[PDB]
């Protein structure tokens, strides 16, 4: 990955951004560069090929220049739907092979704040027959994509047996996450009530279940 890209580039809605790709003469200086978009958790899509050319369908808001030992992808009229990962591509003669840039994550800022809608499920009776109990706390539709999860059992806090996923961008550019409290059936039956507490942008929000 001799091709150097900025790890992250941010932008406000409507503005223009630039994503640079730096390399040597062996690669970018002489050979053609192609640009690839990757919407979160999706398959890459050709954006630019041969330095400055657009395939059919690709928005005219996208464009690529190449000058010297460095290439760039410019995006005008930035929209939320442009939130993706962006890779450049080029052949290298000193390397004798094709190399991608490290990639660039694009974030768009103009989105409204959205509080988490928290859903908590008790263990199923089917699982309780297996002498096991899993509490499922599902968190979705929150922006910005940062939350903290804590488990309360009655009054005291819970640490052991907690597994929480990282936040992940949904299709609507909001974020989702999930937390699991894995207990034996008798752990579950022993306490009075369990609580999942999602903290997001100052305000903590709570959901609670019981046998």
């Amino acid at each position: 990955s001799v091709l150097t890209q900025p790890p992250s580039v941010s932008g406000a809605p409507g503005q223009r951004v630039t994503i640079s790709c730096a390399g040597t003469k062996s690669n970018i200086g002489d050979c053609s560069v192609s640009w690839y978009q990757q919407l979160p958790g999706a398959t890459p899509r050709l954006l630019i090929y041969q330095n400055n050319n657009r395939p059919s369908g690709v928005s005219d808001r996208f464009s690529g220049s190449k000058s010297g030992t460095s290439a760039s992808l410019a995006i005008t009229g930035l929209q939320t739907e442009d939130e993706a990962d962006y890779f450049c591509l080029s052949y290298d003669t000193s390397f004798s092979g094709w190399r991608f840039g490290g990639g660039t994550r694009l974030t768009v800022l103009g989105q409204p704040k959205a509080s988490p809608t928290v859903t908590l499920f008790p263990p199923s009776s089917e699982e309780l027959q297996a002498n096991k109990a899993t509490l499922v706390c599902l968190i979705s539709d929150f922006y910005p994509g940062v939350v903290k999860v804590a488990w309360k059992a009655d009054g005291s806090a819970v640490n052991a047996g907690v597994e929480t996923t990282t936040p992940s961008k949904q299709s609507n550019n909001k974020y989702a996450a999930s937390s699991y409290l894995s207990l034996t059936s008798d752990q579950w039956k022993s306490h009075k009530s369990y609580s999942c507490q999602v903290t997001h942008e100052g305000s903590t929000v709570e959901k609670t279940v019981a046998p």
């Binding site: 050709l46 591509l89 990639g103 499922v136």
Partner: protein
């Protein structure tokens, strides 16, 4: 209109070889301007050019992986096969199949203008395990779900009523327990009034264990 599809194992033991097969349609590998390429992408990292074979048997293989990689084709049957010897955990990645197009001459004008959906390969000494499927149930609307607990390796797919129900389905990314096992959950937000009449069944697929379980989710 052009499509590609990757075929291969979801799970491979360390040091064992990986063999990937691309099956394409809508274009011919006999065309003087096309090639087929294999790209891989580790979880949360950059795209990586593995290998590509061209219409005239020209091979562009990643020189960092030359000793491990070999490629071969079958134009009349539209098949391209990649092998990677001696797999490591570090080689755990999604592997993509793609059509490279290019201008004859031009000097490396190649570009990947078509992509397969990618296949997730996991390199682990751990053994394949299928999940246990559990229902998730409790004023305007209501949330129903399914717990897909303890499976390995990724991936898992979930539909509802054999895919007839898509609206208001949200299937969450999987969690990785300290047990080395995956788990996820799939919810669907359905009208509260429909709980009396409508019947909801989550369809859970885990091809790595050949597991497909239907589950009724009532109260």
């Amino acid at each position: 209109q052009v499509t590609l599809k990757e075929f291969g194992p979801a799970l491979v033991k360390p040091t064992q070889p990986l063999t990937l097969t691309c099956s394409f349609s809508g274009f011919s590998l006999r065309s003087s301007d096309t090639a087929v390429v294999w790209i891989r992408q580790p979880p949360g990292k950059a795209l990586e050019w593995l290998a590509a074979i061209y219409w005239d048997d020209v091979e562009h293989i990643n020189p960092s992986l030359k000793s491990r990689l070999s490629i071969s084709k079958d134009s009349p049957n539209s098949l391209v096969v990649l092998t990677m010897a001696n797999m490591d955990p570090v080689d755990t990645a999604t592997y993509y199949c793609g059509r490279v197009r290019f201008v004859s001459g031009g000097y490396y004008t190649d570009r990947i203008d078509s992509w397969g959906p990618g296949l997730l390969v996991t390199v682990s000494s751990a053994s394949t395990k299928g999940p246990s499927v559990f229902p998730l149930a409790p004023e305007s609307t209501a949330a129903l779900g399914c717990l897909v607990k303890d499976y390995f390796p990724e991936p898992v797919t979930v539909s509802w009523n054999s895919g007839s129900l898509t609206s208001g389905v949200h299937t969450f990314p999987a969690v990785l327990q300290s047990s080395g096992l995956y788990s996820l959950s799939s919810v669907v937000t359905v009208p509260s009034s429909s709980l009396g009449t409508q019947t909801y069944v989550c369809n859970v697929n885990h091809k790595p264990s050949n597991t497909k379980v239907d589950k009724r989710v009532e109260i």
